[PDB]
Design a protein around this ligand. Structure first.
Ligand SMILES: N=C(N)c1ccc(/C=N/OCC(=O)O)cc1
Ligand SMILES: [Ca+2]
Length: 223
Protein backbone atom coordinates (compact mmCIF):
# COMPACT_ATOMS: atom_id res chain seq x y z
CA UNK A 1 0.00 0.00 0.00
CA UNK A 2 1.48 3.33 -1.14
CA UNK A 3 0.49 6.54 0.71
CA UNK A 4 -1.67 4.76 3.29
CA UNK A 5 -1.61 4.43 7.05
CA UNK A 6 -0.88 1.84 9.71
CA UNK A 7 -4.24 0.09 10.23
CA UNK A 8 -3.90 -0.75 13.90
CA UNK A 9 -3.49 -4.34 15.14
CA UNK A 10 -6.44 -6.59 14.24
CA UNK A 11 -8.69 -3.70 13.12
CA UNK A 12 -9.07 -5.50 9.76
CA UNK A 13 -9.94 -8.94 11.18
CA UNK A 14 -10.94 -10.45 7.81
CA UNK A 15 -7.50 -9.70 6.27
CA UNK A 16 -5.39 -12.80 5.69
CA UNK A 17 -1.81 -13.37 4.52
CA UNK A 18 -1.13 -16.20 2.09
CA UNK A 19 2.23 -17.80 2.88
CA UNK A 20 4.33 -20.24 0.82
CA UNK A 21 7.45 -19.98 2.96
CA UNK A 22 7.05 -16.17 2.78
CA UNK A 23 4.11 -13.73 2.46
CA UNK A 24 3.11 -13.47 -1.21
CA UNK A 25 -0.53 -12.26 -1.36
CA UNK A 26 -3.47 -11.08 0.71
CA UNK A 27 -6.97 -12.55 0.95
CA UNK A 28 -10.28 -12.04 2.75
CA UNK A 29 -11.94 -14.46 5.20
CA UNK A 30 -15.58 -14.89 4.11
CA UNK A 31 -16.59 -17.57 6.64
CA UNK A 32 -14.77 -19.92 9.06
CA UNK A 33 -13.59 -22.19 6.22
CA UNK A 34 -13.09 -20.04 3.12
CA UNK A 35 -10.88 -17.23 1.81
CA UNK A 36 -11.41 -15.11 -1.29
CA UNK A 37 -8.22 -14.03 -3.10
CA UNK A 38 -7.01 -13.24 -6.65
CA UNK A 39 -6.58 -16.09 -9.14
CA UNK A 40 -3.19 -14.57 -10.06
CA UNK A 41 -2.19 -15.50 -6.45
CA UNK A 42 -2.67 -19.18 -7.17
CA UNK A 43 0.10 -21.55 -6.11
CA UNK A 44 0.33 -24.97 -4.44
CA UNK A 45 1.28 -25.34 -0.75
CA UNK A 46 -0.56 -22.28 0.58
CA UNK A 47 -0.76 -21.66 4.32
CA UNK A 48 -3.40 -19.11 5.34
CA UNK A 49 -2.39 -16.82 8.22
CA UNK A 50 -5.19 -15.14 10.16
CA UNK A 51 -5.12 -12.62 13.00
CA UNK A 52 -1.85 -11.11 11.69
CA UNK A 53 -0.53 -7.65 12.32
CA UNK A 54 3.26 -7.86 12.14
CA UNK A 55 3.74 -10.63 9.54
CA UNK A 56 7.33 -11.27 10.67
CA UNK A 57 6.59 -11.71 14.41
CA UNK A 58 4.29 -14.15 16.19
CA UNK A 59 2.39 -11.74 18.49
CA UNK A 60 -0.10 -14.22 20.01
CA UNK A 61 -3.36 -13.82 18.11
CA UNK A 62 -2.48 -15.68 14.92
CA UNK A 63 -4.04 -18.78 13.45
CA UNK A 64 -1.98 -20.53 10.76
CA UNK A 65 -4.11 -22.99 8.76
CA UNK A 66 -3.04 -24.92 5.67
CA UNK A 67 -5.18 -24.72 2.54
CA UNK A 68 -6.88 -28.01 1.62
CA UNK A 69 -7.97 -26.86 -1.86
CA UNK A 70 -7.76 -23.84 -4.12
CA UNK A 71 -10.36 -23.12 -6.78
CA UNK A 72 -9.49 -20.66 -9.51
CA UNK A 73 -12.45 -19.11 -11.32
CA UNK A 74 -13.34 -21.31 -14.38
CA UNK A 75 -13.07 -18.29 -16.72
CA UNK A 76 -9.93 -16.71 -15.22
CA UNK A 77 -7.71 -15.36 -18.00
CA UNK A 78 -4.15 -14.74 -16.77
CA UNK A 79 -3.33 -12.57 -19.80
CA UNK A 80 -6.17 -10.03 -19.38
CA UNK A 81 -6.77 -10.75 -15.67
CA UNK A 82 -10.47 -11.04 -16.47
CA UNK A 83 -12.20 -13.01 -13.63
CA UNK A 84 -9.22 -12.59 -11.29
CA UNK A 85 -10.76 -14.44 -8.31
CA UNK A 86 -10.01 -17.66 -6.44
CA UNK A 87 -11.44 -19.46 -3.40
CA UNK A 88 -9.20 -21.13 -0.86
CA UNK A 89 -10.60 -23.70 1.58
CA UNK A 90 -8.98 -24.10 5.00
CA UNK A 91 -8.02 -27.61 6.24
CA UNK A 92 -9.76 -26.79 9.53
CA UNK A 93 -12.26 -24.08 10.48
CA UNK A 94 -10.84 -20.83 11.88
CA UNK A 95 -11.89 -19.88 15.39
CA UNK A 96 -13.85 -16.63 14.92
CA UNK A 97 -13.27 -13.90 17.55
CA UNK A 98 -12.54 -10.14 17.78
CA UNK A 99 -9.24 -10.53 15.94
CA UNK A 100 -10.35 -13.10 13.35
CA UNK A 101 -13.71 -12.42 11.69
CA UNK A 102 -15.44 -12.91 8.37
CA UNK A 103 -16.37 -10.14 5.94
CA UNK A 104 -19.81 -10.08 4.26
CA UNK A 105 -20.30 -10.74 0.56
CA UNK A 106 -22.23 -8.00 -1.23
CA UNK A 107 -25.89 -8.29 -2.23
CA UNK A 108 -25.57 -5.35 -4.63
CA UNK A 109 -22.60 -3.72 -6.40
CA UNK A 110 -20.84 -0.70 -4.90
CA UNK A 111 -21.36 2.84 -6.17
CA UNK A 112 -18.93 5.18 -7.94
CA UNK A 113 -17.68 7.73 -5.40
CA UNK A 114 -17.90 5.36 -2.42
CA UNK A 115 -14.84 5.43 -0.16
CA UNK A 116 -13.54 1.88 0.37
CA UNK A 117 -10.89 0.39 2.66
CA UNK A 118 -8.00 -1.40 0.91
CA UNK A 119 -5.38 -3.20 3.00
CA UNK A 120 -2.23 -5.28 2.78
CA UNK A 121 1.44 -5.91 3.46
CA UNK A 122 2.56 -4.91 -0.06
CA UNK A 123 5.19 -2.44 -1.28
CA UNK A 124 4.86 1.05 0.22
CA UNK A 125 6.93 2.84 -2.46
CA UNK A 126 5.71 4.14 -5.85
CA UNK A 127 9.33 3.96 -7.00
CA UNK A 128 11.76 1.62 -5.29
CA UNK A 129 10.92 -1.16 -2.86
CA UNK A 130 10.04 -1.20 0.83
CA UNK A 131 7.88 -3.81 2.53
CA UNK A 132 6.17 -2.99 5.84
CA UNK A 133 5.98 -5.32 8.82
CA UNK A 134 2.54 -4.25 10.02
CA UNK A 135 -0.71 -4.17 8.07
CA UNK A 136 -1.27 -1.02 6.01
CA UNK A 137 -4.59 0.57 5.04
CA UNK A 138 -5.81 3.02 2.42
CA UNK A 139 -9.12 4.77 2.02
CA UNK A 140 -9.85 5.20 -1.69
CA UNK A 141 -12.95 6.03 -3.76
CA UNK A 142 -14.44 3.96 -6.54
CA UNK A 143 -13.88 5.75 -9.86
CA UNK A 144 -16.44 6.08 -12.66
CA UNK A 145 -16.31 3.33 -15.26
CA UNK A 146 -15.66 5.95 -17.96
CA UNK A 147 -12.58 7.33 -16.12
CA UNK A 148 -11.45 3.72 -15.48
CA UNK A 149 -11.73 2.83 -19.18
CA UNK A 150 -10.00 6.10 -20.15
CA UNK A 151 -7.09 5.24 -17.85
CA UNK A 152 -6.71 1.75 -19.33
CA UNK A 153 -8.14 1.80 -22.86
CA UNK A 154 -9.07 -1.64 -24.18
CA UNK A 155 -8.30 -3.42 -20.89
CA UNK A 156 -11.23 -2.89 -18.52
CA UNK A 157 -13.96 -5.52 -18.53
CA UNK A 158 -17.35 -5.51 -16.79
CA UNK A 159 -15.64 -7.67 -14.10
CA UNK A 160 -13.27 -4.88 -13.06
CA UNK A 161 -13.46 -1.49 -11.43
CA UNK A 162 -10.95 1.25 -10.67
CA UNK A 163 -10.43 2.86 -7.28
CA UNK A 164 -7.93 5.43 -6.07
CA UNK A 165 -6.60 8.82 -7.09
CA UNK A 166 -5.84 9.93 -10.64
CA UNK A 167 -3.27 12.41 -9.29
CA UNK A 168 -1.28 9.41 -8.02
CA UNK A 169 0.51 9.03 -4.68
CA UNK A 170 -2.06 6.65 -3.09
CA UNK A 171 -2.67 3.07 -4.27
CA UNK A 172 -2.34 -0.64 -3.56
CA UNK A 173 0.83 -2.30 -4.91
CA UNK A 174 2.80 -5.55 -5.39
CA UNK A 175 2.29 -7.81 -2.35
CA UNK A 176 -1.25 -6.45 -1.73
CA UNK A 177 -2.58 -8.70 -4.53
CA UNK A 178 -5.61 -10.80 -3.55
CA UNK A 179 -6.42 -8.55 -0.60
CA UNK A 180 -9.72 -6.85 0.28
CA UNK A 181 -11.44 -3.75 -1.00
CA UNK A 182 -14.31 -3.32 1.48
CA UNK A 183 -17.02 -0.73 0.82
CA UNK A 184 -19.86 -0.09 3.27
CA UNK A 185 -18.94 -3.27 5.18
CA UNK A 186 -19.06 -5.61 2.14
CA UNK A 187 -16.21 -7.26 0.21
CA UNK A 188 -16.61 -5.43 -3.13
CA UNK A 189 -13.15 -5.78 -4.68
CA UNK A 190 -9.95 -7.83 -4.78
CA UNK A 191 -6.54 -6.24 -5.37
CA UNK A 192 -5.88 -7.28 -9.00
CA UNK A 193 -3.68 -5.05 -11.18
CA UNK A 194 -2.52 -1.61 -12.30
CA UNK A 195 0.33 0.04 -14.17
CA UNK A 196 3.00 0.42 -11.49
CA UNK A 197 1.64 1.75 -8.18
CA UNK A 198 0.38 5.24 -7.29
CA UNK A 199 1.21 6.52 -10.77
CA UNK A 200 -0.59 9.54 -12.21
CA UNK A 201 -3.62 8.51 -14.33
CA UNK A 202 -3.05 4.85 -13.47
CA UNK A 203 -5.41 3.95 -10.60
CA UNK A 204 -5.74 0.49 -9.06
CA UNK A 205 -7.87 -2.10 -10.90
CA UNK A 206 -9.94 -4.46 -8.78
CA UNK A 207 -11.94 -7.64 -9.34
CA UNK A 208 -15.67 -6.81 -9.18
CA UNK A 209 -16.74 -9.27 -6.43
CA UNK A 210 -20.50 -8.56 -6.77
CA UNK A 211 -20.40 -10.38 -10.15
CA UNK A 212 -19.17 -13.60 -8.47
CA UNK A 213 -21.51 -14.07 -5.50
CA UNK A 214 -23.52 -16.80 -7.26
CA UNK A 215 -20.32 -18.70 -8.23
CA UNK A 216 -18.92 -18.26 -4.71
CA UNK A 217 -22.09 -19.57 -3.05
CA UNK A 218 -22.41 -22.52 -5.45
CA UNK A 219 -18.75 -23.42 -5.04
CA UNK A 220 -18.75 -23.29 -1.22
CA UNK A 221 -21.95 -25.36 -1.18
CA UNK A 222 -20.20 -28.17 -3.07
CA UNK A 223 -16.65 -28.22 -1.72
N1 LIG B 1 -3.13 -0.97 -7.50
C1 LIG B 1 -2.04 -1.20 -8.25
N2 LIG B 1 -1.46 -0.24 -8.86
C2 LIG B 1 -1.53 -2.61 -8.34
C3 LIG B 1 -2.33 -3.64 -7.87
C4 LIG B 1 -1.91 -4.96 -7.94
C5 LIG B 1 -0.67 -5.27 -8.46
C6 LIG B 1 -0.30 -6.70 -8.49
N3 LIG B 1 0.86 -7.16 -8.71
O1 LIG B 1 1.00 -8.52 -8.71
C7 LIG B 1 2.26 -9.08 -8.35
C8 LIG B 1 2.42 -9.08 -6.85
O2 LIG B 1 1.45 -8.61 -6.06
O3 LIG B 1 3.44 -9.50 -6.35
C9 LIG B 1 0.15 -4.25 -8.94
C10 LIG B 1 -0.28 -2.91 -8.88
CA1 LIG C 1 2.33 -11.94 13.49
Amino acid sequence: IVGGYTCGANTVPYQVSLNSGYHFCGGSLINSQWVVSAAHCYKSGIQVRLGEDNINVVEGNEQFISASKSIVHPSYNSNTLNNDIMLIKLKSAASLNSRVASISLPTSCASAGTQCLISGWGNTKSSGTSYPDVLKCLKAPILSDSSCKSAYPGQITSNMFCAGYLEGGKDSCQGDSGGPVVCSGKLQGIVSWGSGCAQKNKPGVYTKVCNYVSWIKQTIASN
